[PDB]
């Protein structure tokens, strides 16, 4: 069980920790988050009371260092930092726990939600999508655009997701135009899986990360990426059976966790109706289809 201590909470802010969130009042005696489960990536995210513009946050893994939050009054945000003095850090944390100035990461023992949303997400892969190498954690916010978005403007602050484009020479073999456009198996299995991702775990990890950035920060290009990666599997006639079965589980927990009131902007009607009802895999996503129909029948 690890800890992310806070120097202080100078401004009123809703703090998120994974799928949990709580309100901290301006100058309330809040000194961070304890009992964070080890073995998973986490995200700690922020929305200022006074400017709901820019949700922002940090992906991190407590196995990779000791991290804390400190408000910067110049740049105007809560910043994650690393404390390299291990003894100074344990001593800080222990004083804050003794005086009980920390919230407890509030995981119910029955609850596998976070594991199920982050099964294939690895910090090392996140750090290749979010390029800021001097730090072991990664900043994301609502406004960051994706590399593909910039092609259609700051490269250092981009999300470098894998470019998927169904009408591209990468996706379409000369002489197999119709075949490859209607059945994307070649593009999924040879180009993407074997050539770029190497295995379906990396594929699913990026897919899961895209969804989480879309959900927690309303990052529009992440949502585009998540839907593209779903659609590429569903538009492929030939998909490993274990991938299909795992995709069904992945999406099921994603749809389960989405806020009900956000379904209108985080869910692309065209992609979902095609995946569940028209595509090759229309009959292969039983759990996802059943929750989608019982929770968002409007979209469909």
């Amino acid at each position: 069980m690890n800890t992310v201590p806070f120097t202080s909470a100078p401004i009123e802010v809703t703090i998120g920790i994974d799928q949990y969130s709580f309100n901290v009042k301006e100058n309330q005696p809040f000194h961070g988050i304890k009992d964070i489960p080890i073995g998973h990536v986490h995200v700690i995210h922020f929305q200022h009371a006074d400017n709901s513009s820019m949700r922002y946050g940090y992906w991190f893994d407590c196995r990779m260092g000791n991290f804390y939050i400190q408000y910067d009054p110049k740049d105007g945000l809560y910043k994650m930092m690393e404390e390299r003095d291990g003894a100074k850090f344990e001593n800080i944390v222990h004083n804050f726990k003794e005086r009980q100035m920390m919230v407890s990461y509030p995981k119910i023992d029955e609850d596998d939600t976070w594991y199920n949303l982050t099964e294939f997400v690895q910090m090392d892969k996140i750090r290749k999508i979010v390029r800021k190498d001097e730090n072991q954690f990664s900043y994301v916010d609502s406004s960051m655009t994706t590399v593909q978005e910039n092609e259609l403007s700051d490269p250092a602050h981009s999300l470098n997701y894998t470019v998927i484009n169904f009408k591209s020479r990468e996706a379409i073999r000369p002489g197999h135009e119709m075949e490859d456009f209607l059945d994307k198996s070649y593009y999924l299995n040879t180009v993407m899986l074997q050539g770029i991702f190497k295995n379906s775990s990396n594929y699913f990890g990026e897919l899961q990360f895209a969804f989480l950035n879309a959900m927690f920060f309303g990052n529009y290009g992440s949502s585009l990426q998540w839907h593209a990666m779903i659609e590429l599997i569903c538009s492929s006639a030939t998909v490993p059976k274990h991938m299909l079965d795992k995709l069904d589980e992945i999406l099921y927990y994603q749809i389960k966790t989405l806020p009900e009131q956000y379904s209108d902007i985080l869910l692309n009607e065209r992609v979902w109706n095609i995946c569940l009802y028209s595509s090759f895999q229309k009959n292969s996503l039983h759990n996802t289809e059943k929750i989608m129909e019982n929770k968002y029948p409007e979209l469909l």
């Binding site: 009408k167 591209s168 020479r169 379409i172 135009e177 119709m178 456009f181």
Partner: protein, 237 residues
């Protein structure tokens, strides 16, 4: 984007462009089987690819053999069309390649866009104009070459005959669109109009009769009358 009434001038500018019509690519006759079921028999078709400024028609004949053993023929026809248009472009010298290809039906956009990925600088565009190019098989000499073909074949025509010696391309395309709209609405009457006068002939190297300018005005008026008529006959007005 799309091509509508606001930009007639762009059709006749000096940027090479082609209209592509796929409506006669996959043609069938529907009939009863001995068992009383229904079956189709395909007949030869054509891709109608037209430079509206020069009148050059690239008539790609689709021989029925191309459909043998194939499934989902109406979807395949759009991709076959795309493939043959892309092959045509690659066969033209760079300075003759089109800068835009306008498809007369939106279902062709994706097939053509995918076949032309090698040509990122050629714009693939839809149109809102209701062009009557499906009636191209009402032009006797075009119908004749398609039906007689025994193999795939490309045949080059000028759909305006010699008209550009005397009129502009905006007027030639307007006359062609008018003759074709009339042939599409009532082929018999349209054809009677064009041929009632035995003394006005079709030169061997032409598609349409050799009308003088005065006679074209009379002809063009008569086709309007026909289109307007049929439109009443149809709605009762």
């Amino acid at each position: 984007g799309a091509m509508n009434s606001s930009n007639y001038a762009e059709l006749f500018n000096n940027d090479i462009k082609l209209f592509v019509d796929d409506t006669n690519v996959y043609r069938v006759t529907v009939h009863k089987t001995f068992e009383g079921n229904v079956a189709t028999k395909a007949i030869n078709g054509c891709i109608f690819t037209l430079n509206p400024k020069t009148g050059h028609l690239f008539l790609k004949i689709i021989h029925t053999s191309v459909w043998a053993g194939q499934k989902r023929l109406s979807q395949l026809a759009k991709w076959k069309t795309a493939e043959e248009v892309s092959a045509l472009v690659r066969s033209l010298p760079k300075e003759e390649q089109p800068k835009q290809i306008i498809v007369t039906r939106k279902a062709m956009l994706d097939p053509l866009e995918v076949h032309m990925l090698d040509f990122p600088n050629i714009a693939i565009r839809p149109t809102e104009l209701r062009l009557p190019f499906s009636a191209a098989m009402s032009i006797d000499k075009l119908s004749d070459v398609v039906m007689k073909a025994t193999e795939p074949q490309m045949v080059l025509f000028n759909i305006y005959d010699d008209w550009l010696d005397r009129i502009s391309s905006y007027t030639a395309f307007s006359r062609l669109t008018l003759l074709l709209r009339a042939l599409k609405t009532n082929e018999e009457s349209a054809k009677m109009i064009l041929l009632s006068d035995p003394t006005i002939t079709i030169k061997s190297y032409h598609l349409w009769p050799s009308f003088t300018d005065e006679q074209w005005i009379t002809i063009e008026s008569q086709m309007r009358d026909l289109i307007l008529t049929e439109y009443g006959r149809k709605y009762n007005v």
